[PDB]
Amino acid sequence: ALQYEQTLMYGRYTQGEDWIFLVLLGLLMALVSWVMDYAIAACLQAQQWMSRGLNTSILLQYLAWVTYPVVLITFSAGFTQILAPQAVGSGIPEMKTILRGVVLKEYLTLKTFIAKVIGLTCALGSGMPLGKEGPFVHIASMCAALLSKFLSLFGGIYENESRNTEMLAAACAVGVGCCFAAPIGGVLFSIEVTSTFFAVRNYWRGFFAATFSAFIFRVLAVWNRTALFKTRFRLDFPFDLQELPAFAVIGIASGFGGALFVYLNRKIVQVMRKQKTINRFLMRKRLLFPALVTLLISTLTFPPGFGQFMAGQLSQKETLVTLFDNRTWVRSTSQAWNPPRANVFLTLVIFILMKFWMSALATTIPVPCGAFMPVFVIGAAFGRLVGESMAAWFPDGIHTDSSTYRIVPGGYAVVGAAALAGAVTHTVSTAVIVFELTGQIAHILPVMIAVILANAVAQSLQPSLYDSIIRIKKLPYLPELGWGRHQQYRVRVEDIMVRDVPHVALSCTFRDLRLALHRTKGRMLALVESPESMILLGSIERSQVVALLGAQLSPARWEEQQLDEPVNFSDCKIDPAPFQLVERTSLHKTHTIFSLLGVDHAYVTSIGRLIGIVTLKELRKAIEG
């Protein structure tokens, strides 16, 4: 049962009914998502109306431009701090930890729900580079937990990793699907990021609930007024051969850029911690840091100033719509991306760089925020840059004669966005996500090629963004196995296990019991039938063995030496050791046991003897090295 500890950036953790459930879950998530999107749109409309309402001078315009987001972010941070501090940042690493059996103290309560909803609505109502995929996963999980509490549904199960898995996994799928407005892509994306082994049954349940959410969204849209970023490209040979190398280059560069983004985020988090005086000073005044970051970012996007060279007038939706259009800029979209004192290439480059560092910095402030849409937009810009370069180099066409069939620079943007998002998140379901978002499937082969290349390059350099956050927040972490090297198949348990394995016997006089407990820094002590045979029987928890010493050594009626020879273990609570290891088990079989069986450690036996132990620490050392 870990407990949250507040920090400047992120934080730290220290020591017949199924169908009704799914229908209600989908309906609730659809309604919540609709209300929140309405609120965010209203906030953005208010921002624009105030921006154009007071256009007296540069001073007043700048004051409004920098004072609206600062106030919104400050209110969001203060409200989150007062209600529930644990509800800041992305909620995907935390739910991945929870689905492995770990318990977080108050992660799925009602105050956390209210704080996350209000904080996300206020934080996305400004113009900061933030997403909402992790927050939506967490919100859907809280919806599922409250629904299960209302009608008692999963109380029968005994294990933690089995009771949580069903409802929470379906909820994660629904949350991603409602965020992206893409059911199948959302379910596939949620499977990849929140687990390693996923049952087909839970895939079916997520599919069902996501379909119901999509139906509710369609009914609401018809009742009021593909869906998000529909593109209109020509269906007659949209791309030719001899253009595939461009998509391969996009994929490789996207892999490198995604690794760099994850590294920059971690480096930003680490540097602030090392600086001590600044850290304490900012900890006394918590609200200063989000406000200072917002004021720095909003000043550089002021349109009359430096914001004209990076298309600072457009919103995130407007930016994504203009980059996906079916027009060639080299031969509103252009007017925003073509300033009178600049080209489209310079504007695209400046947008890419500035948005890169801005998003990396902004995704660390203490508000409920995500990181999918920023990197999606950066990838779209990079793809558009490559596509415009290709169109400028081949004005008439690439395939033999002119043939009236020229390069479509929007397809390159569609490819690059998915490639960079997949490189950052370590997923390949961004392909299906972009197919559902754009409403067209013509550029399927280039998208797949770029996404696979980006994943292959990125996995060889850095962990996923969520794995990085897991490492930062000091949460339990199993390292992902590896791809492209066959040296892991020759590593066995006998070469990574530790033969210390502190233990007690059945005889186990208090003289013997005291020495073993203080000689180790672990959490549990193994139990053996006899020190001659050392046959494993189970474990004994640290908080219990001290009670065995405490209950005996407590004042009762020098005398301290009259209470050591015997022992009692019938009154003790001995947990079993069902899953063990053999000397010749491989590294891959060990990884499978740790990931899905809900265990943290495993004991190695020959026949019944206790020869060594393997913990998560040895697994990290073996996999990394």
Of residues 465 through 524, those in contact with a copy of itself by CB under 8 A are 480-481, 483-486, 489-490, 492
For residue 492, what is the enclosing H or E element? none
> Based on CB atoms, which residue is closest to Cl ion, 239 or 372?
372
Q: Is 420 or 431 the residue whose CB approaches a copy of itself more closely?
A: 431
Answer with the entry of a copy of itself, Cl ion, none that 593 interacts with (C-beta below 5 to 8 A by kind).
Answer: a copy of itself
Backbone torsions φ then ψ of 525, nearest 5 degrees: -125, 125
Site for Cl ion in 347-376 (CB under 5 A): 370, 372-373
492 and 581 Cβ atoms separated by less than 8 Å: no
As a whole number of angstroms, the distance between CA 84 and CA 301 comes to 32
90 is in an annotated binding site: yes
Contact partner, 49, from a copy of itself, Cl ion, none, Cβ < 5-8 Å per class: none
Tell which one of 162, 315, 334, 402 touches a copy of itself (CB under 8 A). 162
Among 39, 199, 272, 330, binds a copy of itself (CB under 8 A): 199
Considering only the stretches 10-18, 39-47, 72-80, 400-408, report the one whose residues sit in contact with a copy of itself under the rule CB under 8 A. 10-18
Smaller CB separation from Cl ion, 359 or 605: 359
Q: Which does 233 bind (CB under 5 to 8 A by kind): a copy of itself, Cl ion, none?
A: none
Amino acid symbol at 584: R
The whole-angstrom separation of Cα 136 and Cα 220 is 19
465 binds Cl ion (CB under 5 A): no
- Tell me if residue 155 falls in helix, strand or coil: coil
Q: Residue from 340, 584, 624, 625 that binds a copy of itself (CB under 8 A)?
A: 584
Structural contact between residues 237 and 405, judged by C-beta atoms closer than 8 angstroms: yes
CB under 5 to 8 A by kind: which of a copy of itself, Cl ion, none does 556 bind?
Answer: none
Tell whether residue 389 is among the known ligand binding residues. Answer: no
Query: Residue 448's binding partner, choosing from a copy of itself, Cl ion, none, with beta-carbon cut-off 5 to 8 A by kind?
Result: a copy of itself
What b/e sequence results for 441-476 when a residue is b if at least 16 CB atoms lie within 10 Å of its CB, and e otherwise? ebbeebbbbbbbbbbebbbeebbbbbbbbbebbebe
Contact between 343 and a copy of itself per CB under 8 A: no
Residue 343 binding: pick among a copy of itself, Cl ion, none (C-beta 5-8 Å cut-off by kind)? none
**Residues 18-47: x/- map of binding to a copy of itself (CB under 8 A)?**
xx----------------------------
| Pairing outcome for strands 524-528 and 503-504 | parallel
**What residue has token string 């870990």?**
2
Examine residue 226 and tell whether it contacts a copy of itself (CB under 8 A).
Answer: yes
Nearer to Cl ion, 13 or 136 (CB): 136
Q: Which helix (H) or strand (E) holds 541?
A: strand 536-541
- For residues 547 and 129, what is the distance between their CA atoms, to the nearest angstrom? 53
Q: Tokens at residue 30, please?
A: 């659809």
Work out whether 225 is an interface residue with a copy of itself (CB under 8 A). no
* Residue 207 lies near a copy of itself (rule: CB under 8 A): yes
Which residues have C-beta within 8 Å of that of residue 427, sequence separation ≥ 6?
189, 192, 193, 421, 455
The C-alpha angle 100, 101, 102, rounded to 5 degrees, equals: 100
Closer Cβ to Cl ion, 128 or 504, answer by number: 128
Contact flags string 520-559 toward a copy of itself, x per CB under 8 A = ---------x---x-xxxx---------------------
Site map 64..83 versus a copy of itself, x via CB under 8 A: --------------------
Residue 425 in contact with Cl ion, rule: CB under 5 A:
no
d(CA 202, CA 173): 10
Q: Which is nearer to Cl ion, 133 or 325 (CB)?
A: 133
Candidates 36-44, 106-114, 424-432, 539-547; binding stretch for a copy of itself (CB under 8 A): 424-432
| SS3 call for 614 | strand
Q: With CB cut-offs between 5 and 8 Å by kind, which of Cl ion, a copy of itself, none does residue 372 bind?
A: Cl ion
Question: First CA to last CA across the chain, in angstroms?
Answer: 30
Tokens of 513: 């019991």
The only residue of 5, 17, 495, 500 in contact with a copy of itself, by rule CB under 8 A: 17
Was 158 annotated as part of a binding site? no
Q: Is 205 in the site for a copy of itself (CB under 8 A)?
A: yes
CB neighbourhood size of 341 (10 A): 7
Q: Are 435 and 418 in contact (CB under 8 A)?
A: no
**Distance between CA atoms of 7 and 371, rounded to whole angstroms?**
20
Identified binder of a copy of itself from the candidate list 34, 75, 79, 203, rule CB under 8 A: 203
| 625 near a copy of itself, rule: CB under 8 A | no
The residues, any chain, with a CB within 8 Å of residue 575's CB and separated by 6 or more, are 538, 539, 540, 541
For residues 246-285, which are near a copy of itself according to CB under 8 A?
Answer: none
133 binds, among Cl ion, a copy of itself, none (CB under 5 to 8 A by kind): Cl ion
Select 318 or 600, whichever has its Cβ closest to a copy of itself.
600
154 binds, among a copy of itself, Cl ion, none (CB under 5 to 8 A by kind): a copy of itself
**From CA 625, how far away is CA 621, in angstroms rounded?**
6
**Is 201 among the residues that bind a copy of itself (CB under 8 A)?**
yes
Residues 6+ away with beta carbon under 8 Å from 397: 403, 404, 405, 406, 407
- In 58-155 the beta strands, taken as DSSP E runs, fall at none
* Residue 286: partners with Cβ closer than 8 Å, 6 or more residues away: 77, 81, 366
At 15, which helix (H) or strand (E)? none
Q: Which of 73, 119, 133, 217 binds Cl ion (CB under 5 A)?
A: 133
* Smallest separation (angstroms) from a copy of itself to the CB of 488: 9
- Looking at beta carbons only, is 59 or 222 nearer to a copy of itself? 222
Cα torsion through 145, 149, 151, 156, rounded to 10 = 90
279 vs 585, which CB is nearer to a copy of itself?
A: 585
- Helix 244-274 with 444-459: angle, nearest 10 deg: 40
CB 259 to a copy of itself: min, Å: 16
Q: Do strands 536-541 and 524-528 pair parallel, antiparallel, or not at all (unpaired)?
A: antiparallel
Tell the smallest beta-carbon distance from residue 507 to a copy of itself (Å).
15
Instruction: State the binding partner of 582 from Cl ion, a copy of itself, none, CB within 5 to 8 A by kind.
Output: a copy of itself
Residues forming beta bridges with residue 12, ordered by sequence position:
5
Known binding residues for chloride are: 90, 372, 466
Binding footprint of Cl ion on the chain (CB under 5 A): 131-133, 370, 372-373
Known binding residues are: 90, 372, 466
